[PDB]
Amino acid sequence: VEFVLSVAGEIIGLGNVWRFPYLCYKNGGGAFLIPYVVFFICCGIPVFFLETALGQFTSEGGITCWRKVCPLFEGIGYATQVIEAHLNVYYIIILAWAIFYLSNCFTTELPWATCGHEWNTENCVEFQKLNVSNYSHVSLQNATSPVMEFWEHRVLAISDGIEHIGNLRWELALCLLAAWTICYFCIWKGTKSTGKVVYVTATFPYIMLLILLIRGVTLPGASEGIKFYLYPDLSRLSDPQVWVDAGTQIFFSYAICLGCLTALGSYNNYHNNCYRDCIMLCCLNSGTSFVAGFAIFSVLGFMAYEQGVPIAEVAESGPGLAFIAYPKAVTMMPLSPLWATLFFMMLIFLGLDSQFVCVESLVTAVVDMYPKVFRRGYRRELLILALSVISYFLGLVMLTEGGMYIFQLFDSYAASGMCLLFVAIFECICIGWVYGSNRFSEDIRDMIGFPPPSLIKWCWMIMTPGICAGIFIFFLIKYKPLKYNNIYTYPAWGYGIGWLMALSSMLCIPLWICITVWKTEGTLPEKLQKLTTPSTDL
Amino acid sequence: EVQLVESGGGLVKPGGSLKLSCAASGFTFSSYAMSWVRQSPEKRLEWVAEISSGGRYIYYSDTVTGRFTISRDNARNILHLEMSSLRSEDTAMYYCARGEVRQRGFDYWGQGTTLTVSSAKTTAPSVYPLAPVCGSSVTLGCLVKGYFPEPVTLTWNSGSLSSGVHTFPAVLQSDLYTLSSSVTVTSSTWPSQSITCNVAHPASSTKVDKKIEPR
Amino acid sequence: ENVLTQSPAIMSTSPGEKVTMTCRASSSVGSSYLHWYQQKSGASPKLWIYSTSNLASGVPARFSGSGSGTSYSLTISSVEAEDAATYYCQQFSGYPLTFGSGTKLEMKRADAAPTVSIFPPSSEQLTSGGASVVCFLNNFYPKDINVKWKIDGSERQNGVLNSWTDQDSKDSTYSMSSTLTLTKDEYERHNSYTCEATHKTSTSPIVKSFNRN
Ligand SMILES: [Cl-]
């Protein structure tokens, strides 16, 4: 079926197989799911339906859509542009790491499976040469699994602080260059979709996830991992970090408030069904994130079983858990390098698809906002090449010895946290109060046939902005500092630059409001009347 | 519970205009869209207009577009349909349907207001009593000849008799209407009981009662 | 203009019998947009089947729609006297909205002879100067019954009125009314007034004559 195959190619992504188990391990195992389902009910469905309906209603780019819907709140589109730019800066480095693993994978003995190399330290141990072995005192002397040492000391060569940026890893630089040039090739030759290439490269991530889950539940000691994954602690629910990360993981994994969802709705015709597509896409995305959660947490439950250390500190708990649990799982497969290279090719494919659609949405939005310059002299591909070069040069700062901390900061503060919370707050406030929920419900009725069931309407009015403003205020008053490996206690200037770029991603709405008020002034009530009124026939 | 009572309608000249009114109650009128569905005298149903729940998404059929306009008023819970350049082709009985969910349809319909377009004139009805022959079940008749327009409500004995009554639809010839009705009575009932025939013509305000003797 | 058609326009079903209507669409329509209505004789239509599968409030479960694409059907397990009406099919996919031609669900039963009753005009009828003699045909089946007026020594074709009553909900029969339109001068020039109709119960048509005397 063409409908089933095309939809399944958009459910899976890196936000389900890499970011969700990271956020479910860093912010407590089972305590992460309680705000996850709450935001899935109250902010995934309503904001997803809102953005899909608005994108299909206006049927154009994602930043002029807000121009023709509500010209006062046009800064929401520019905030999504900044979020997309930050994402395209650091969404490609995961493909660089996955290429680097693919470089080392083609060997009859895996690099991350034995306890002797140029990078392994003295405190390593095989953890497989004997059943009882000689641990529980080597564990007291900080025993380390070989994959945990391999990642830290060869993949990125971690340094003891963000102030200790070491030499640039040249192999990783070549990996990033290869990722950017294959993304540019996908931009030029590869836009012509369908054929025999979609029947293979769409069900392959689900087959690989299914076989990885089937293996992961078979690993001994996975019962403790699943119990840690599911049984929650309320003391771990007391901090606002879990709530913030759950809500913005909901917003990130659904592409909500990124900016490409308004462009996705514009691709569909005016009479496409928003409600059913939104419901099934959101539910299937939550389900596949949940399944990848089972897989990674079962694997690290086995890791904690084979060590003497408990489940809470057995992996990095930074954004490399998918690069630690998954390389551990593929070692237990018979014919391990085959499954390893197929898995890393899966990661390359499902990261490249999202990067391609993100950069395509960004370039089509920036040439729609500048129509008379980039559509007359054959320079759209030149703009794409210049943007790729610029994001490669700005992206290389995270590939150094200490650049992992910079990547962690921008992952937690660019397409996450306060940026997504503020954009969703102002989006839902705009729709439910400025444009009017009755007018938008009438527009949805004209589009798809039936109005929203008024639960989504009340979510737009009082539920979603209320809960997101509550989470924002709760994060702001009970501030908890960010730690990389759960104990780092970042320097003050690192928090300064993180908050600076998080503000710069979300101060573009009040700045645009201020300059729109200043540019066209007719005193306050006439200004708000002429800015509240929508433009043309939309 | 929910009553879609309607008003307006009557006899209008060709090329004239009329303003129909639909009153809605028992539900939130501003939260459901509305439509006007007409029924031809050949019992052929067709959709005429549709207004949205807000009042800015308005669609028309290809046969009445341009000449027909549909209004709304969410405050007093009323609906309107104003027409211009009425010909003899768009005479019908207009319903006030309610359809908001397009997967649900026009779930709640109205009562129906008869609309007649003709160049003819209004004429008062002439109720003619009918005498039986001179059997067992003696029957009585009452025909009305020379009235205009449709409809006329006719009963027997001012609505007290409704069993064994058979009415007939009006027939159009020479721009006039003719209606009749007959009832069945037993041998003991007639002429022992004075049976009379009543008429109710709204367009002429005529109310006459006739009872016949066996001449 | 998705021109919907229905076949047959007229049908008759005995109670407790299988029956299936249809609604053929000119263009392709969605499977969740086509609806079915039911209009009683002399009443507003009500929603009966929406999205060609479900049933509205108060609809008995013996109604069941089916079909998809362009061919759609309405199936009834066992009909009774409570659902003798006319059914239409609508679509909301394309604008403008269209309805079907309408299938009339009729009933049949054992045939009953008409109760022919001739009514001579009253004394006040000749005041206007015309002649209006009326014959009432009541409680007869089926509707395919011809009537002619017999005058003097020949038949009459001009000035014959026709009025068929719709399907009765009491005893499931029709009623026919015929009026001869003539003048008072022509009334005095004639002496035989007979109305007759060929019913299917008797090969000889039932006759009922009267004289001006
Ligand atoms: Cl997710």
PDB file of N, CA, C and O in Angstrom, chain A residues 57 270-271 435 439 442-443 445-451, chain B residues 33 50 52-57 59 99-103:
ATOM      1  N   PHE A  57      -4.256  24.754   5.805  1.00  0.00           N
ATOM      2  CA  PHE A  57      -5.131  25.894   5.555  1.00  0.00           C
ATOM      3  C   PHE A  57      -4.434  26.964   4.728  1.00  0.00           C
ATOM      4  O   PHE A  57      -4.963  27.416   3.708  1.00  0.00           O
ATOM      5  N   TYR A 270      -6.294  20.673  -0.050  1.00  0.00           N
ATOM      6  CA  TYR A 270      -7.142  21.388   0.899  1.00  0.00           C
ATOM      7  C   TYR A 270      -8.140  20.479   1.606  1.00  0.00           C
ATOM      8  O   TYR A 270      -8.649  20.851   2.668  1.00  0.00           O
ATOM      9  N   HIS A 271      -8.424  19.295   1.059  1.00  0.00           N
ATOM     10  CA  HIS A 271      -9.443  18.415   1.618  1.00  0.00           C
ATOM     11  C   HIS A 271      -8.851  17.154   2.241  1.00  0.00           C
ATOM     12  O   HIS A 271      -9.560  16.155   2.399  1.00  0.00           O
ATOM     13  N   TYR A 435      -6.569  34.786  17.020  1.00  0.00           N
ATOM     14  CA  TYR A 435      -7.333  34.395  15.843  1.00  0.00           C
ATOM     15  C   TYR A 435      -8.729  33.916  16.203  1.00  0.00           C
ATOM     16  O   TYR A 435      -9.633  33.992  15.365  1.00  0.00           O
ATOM     17  N   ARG A 439     -13.287  30.640  15.038  1.00  0.00           N
ATOM     18  CA  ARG A 439     -12.955  30.861  13.635  1.00  0.00           C
ATOM     19  C   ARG A 439     -12.053  29.758  13.096  1.00  0.00           C
ATOM     20  O   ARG A 439     -12.249  29.279  11.971  1.00  0.00           O
ATOM     21  N   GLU A 442     -14.082  26.631  12.660  1.00  0.00           N
ATOM     22  CA  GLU A 442     -14.858  26.744  11.431  1.00  0.00           C
ATOM     23  C   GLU A 442     -13.989  26.488  10.202  1.00  0.00           C
ATOM     24  O   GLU A 442     -14.431  25.837   9.248  1.00  0.00           O
ATOM     25  N   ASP A 443     -12.750  26.991  10.212  1.00  0.00           N
ATOM     26  CA  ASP A 443     -11.828  26.727   9.107  1.00  0.00           C
ATOM     27  C   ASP A 443     -11.505  25.240   8.995  1.00  0.00           C
ATOM     28  O   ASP A 443     -11.436  24.692   7.889  1.00  0.00           O
ATOM     29  N   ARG A 445     -13.485  22.831  10.003  1.00  0.00           N
ATOM     30  CA  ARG A 445     -14.711  22.221   9.498  1.00  0.00           C
ATOM     31  C   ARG A 445     -14.828  22.384   7.989  1.00  0.00           C
ATOM     32  O   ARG A 445     -15.283  21.471   7.293  1.00  0.00           O
ATOM     33  N   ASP A 446     -14.438  23.547   7.469  1.00  0.00           N
ATOM     34  CA  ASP A 446     -14.455  23.749   6.025  1.00  0.00           C
ATOM     35  C   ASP A 446     -13.402  22.902   5.326  1.00  0.00           C
ATOM     36  O   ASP A 446     -13.606  22.475   4.185  1.00  0.00           O
ATOM     37  N   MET A 447     -12.276  22.648   5.993  1.00  0.00           N
ATOM     38  CA  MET A 447     -11.193  21.884   5.384  1.00  0.00           C
ATOM     39  C   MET A 447     -11.501  20.391   5.356  1.00  0.00           C
ATOM     40  O   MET A 447     -11.589  19.782   4.284  1.00  0.00           O
ATOM     41  N   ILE A 448     -11.669  19.786   6.533  1.00  0.00           N
ATOM     42  CA  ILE A 448     -11.754  18.333   6.648  1.00  0.00           C
ATOM     43  C   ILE A 448     -13.183  17.822   6.740  1.00  0.00           C
ATOM     44  O   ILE A 448     -13.400  16.606   6.604  1.00  0.00           O
ATOM     45  N   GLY A 449     -14.162  18.692   6.963  1.00  0.00           N
ATOM     46  CA  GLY A 449     -15.539  18.251   7.023  1.00  0.00           C
ATOM     47  C   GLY A 449     -16.186  18.425   8.381  1.00  0.00           C
ATOM     48  O   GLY A 449     -17.364  18.779   8.469  1.00  0.00           O
ATOM     49  N   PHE A 450     -15.433  18.184   9.447  1.00  0.00           N
ATOM     50  CA  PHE A 450     -15.985  18.228  10.789  1.00  0.00           C
ATOM     51  C   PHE A 450     -15.112  19.084  11.693  1.00  0.00           C
ATOM     52  O   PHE A 450     -13.890  19.124  11.527  1.00  0.00           O
ATOM     53  N   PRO A 451     -15.712  19.780  12.658  1.00  0.00           N
ATOM     54  CA  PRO A 451     -14.933  20.624  13.566  1.00  0.00           C
ATOM     55  C   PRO A 451     -14.153  19.782  14.559  1.00  0.00           C
ATOM     56  O   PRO A 451     -14.388  18.570  14.670  1.00  0.00           O
TER      57      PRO A 451
ATOM     58  N   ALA B  33     -23.485  24.496  11.344  1.00  0.00           N
ATOM     59  CA  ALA B  33     -23.774  25.115  10.062  1.00  0.00           C
ATOM     60  C   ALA B  33     -25.216  24.836   9.651  1.00  0.00           C
ATOM     61  O   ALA B  33     -25.922  24.034  10.265  1.00  0.00           O
ATOM     62  N   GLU B  50     -25.831  26.901   1.554  1.00  0.00           N
ATOM     63  CA  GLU B  50     -25.261  26.446   2.815  1.00  0.00           C
ATOM     64  C   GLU B  50     -24.396  27.550   3.396  1.00  0.00           C
ATOM     65  O   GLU B  50     -23.523  28.083   2.705  1.00  0.00           O
ATOM     66  N   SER B  52     -21.899  28.586   6.815  1.00  0.00           N
ATOM     67  CA  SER B  52     -21.088  27.949   7.837  1.00  0.00           C
ATOM     68  C   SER B  52     -21.517  28.416   9.225  1.00  0.00           C
ATOM     69  O   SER B  52     -22.411  29.250   9.386  1.00  0.00           O
ATOM     70  N   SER B  53     -20.862  27.864  10.249  1.00  0.00           N
ATOM     71  CA  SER B  53     -21.189  28.216  11.625  1.00  0.00           C
ATOM     72  C   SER B  53     -20.749  29.628  11.984  1.00  0.00           C
ATOM     73  O   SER B  53     -21.305  30.218  12.916  1.00  0.00           O
ATOM     74  N   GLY B  54     -19.769  30.179  11.276  1.00  0.00           N
ATOM     75  CA  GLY B  54     -19.345  31.544  11.512  1.00  0.00           C
ATOM     76  C   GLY B  54     -20.105  32.532  10.654  1.00  0.00           C
ATOM     77  O   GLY B  54     -20.644  33.520  11.161  1.00  0.00           O
ATOM     78  N   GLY B  55     -20.156  32.276   9.351  1.00  0.00           N
ATOM     79  CA  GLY B  55     -20.931  33.111   8.460  1.00  0.00           C
ATOM     80  C   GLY B  55     -20.151  33.644   7.278  1.00  0.00           C
ATOM     81  O   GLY B  55     -20.640  34.518   6.557  1.00  0.00           O
ATOM     82  N   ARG B  56     -18.940  33.132   7.062  1.00  0.00           N
ATOM     83  CA  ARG B  56     -18.110  33.589   5.958  1.00  0.00           C
ATOM     84  C   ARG B  56     -17.777  32.504   4.945  1.00  0.00           C
ATOM     85  O   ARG B  56     -17.127  32.807   3.938  1.00  0.00           O
ATOM     86  N   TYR B  57     -18.190  31.260   5.173  1.00  0.00           N
ATOM     87  CA  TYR B  57     -18.007  30.180   4.207  1.00  0.00           C
ATOM     88  C   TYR B  57     -19.380  29.807   3.663  1.00  0.00           C
ATOM     89  O   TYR B  57     -20.123  29.048   4.290  1.00  0.00           O
ATOM     90  N   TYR B  59     -21.694  28.529   0.291  1.00  0.00           N
ATOM     91  CA  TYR B  59     -21.707  27.839  -0.990  1.00  0.00           C
ATOM     92  C   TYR B  59     -23.116  27.821  -1.564  1.00  0.00           C
ATOM     93  O   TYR B  59     -24.106  27.838  -0.826  1.00  0.00           O
ATOM     94  N   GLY B  99     -26.709  20.837   8.994  1.00  0.00           N
ATOM     95  CA  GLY B  99     -25.576  19.953   8.825  1.00  0.00           C
ATOM     96  C   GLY B  99     -24.258  20.624   9.134  1.00  0.00           C
ATOM     97  O   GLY B  99     -23.869  21.574   8.452  1.00  0.00           O
ATOM     98  N   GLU B 100     -23.553  20.130  10.149  1.00  0.00           N
ATOM     99  CA  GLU B 100     -22.248  20.657  10.516  1.00  0.00           C
ATOM    100  C   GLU B 100     -21.130  19.668  10.236  1.00  0.00           C
ATOM    101  O   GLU B 100     -20.166  20.001   9.541  1.00  0.00           O
ATOM    102  N   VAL B 101     -21.239  18.452  10.757  1.00  0.00           N
ATOM    103  CA  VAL B 101     -20.266  17.405  10.471  1.00  0.00           C
ATOM    104  C   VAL B 101     -20.603  16.812   9.110  1.00  0.00           C
ATOM    105  O   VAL B 101     -21.715  16.319   8.897  1.00  0.00           O
ATOM    106  N   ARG B 102     -19.644  16.860   8.186  1.00  0.00           N
ATOM    107  CA  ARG B 102     -19.883  16.352   6.842  1.00  0.00           C
ATOM    108  C   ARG B 102     -19.933  14.832   6.782  1.00  0.00           C
ATOM    109  O   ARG B 102     -20.347  14.285   5.756  1.00  0.00           O
ATOM    110  N   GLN B 103     -19.517  14.143   7.836  1.00  0.00           N
ATOM    111  CA  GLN B 103     -19.687  12.703   7.939  1.00  0.00           C
ATOM    112  C   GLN B 103     -20.976  12.327   8.656  1.00  0.00           C
ATOM    113  O   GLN B 103     -21.235  11.138   8.864  1.00  0.00           O
TER     114      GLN B 103
END
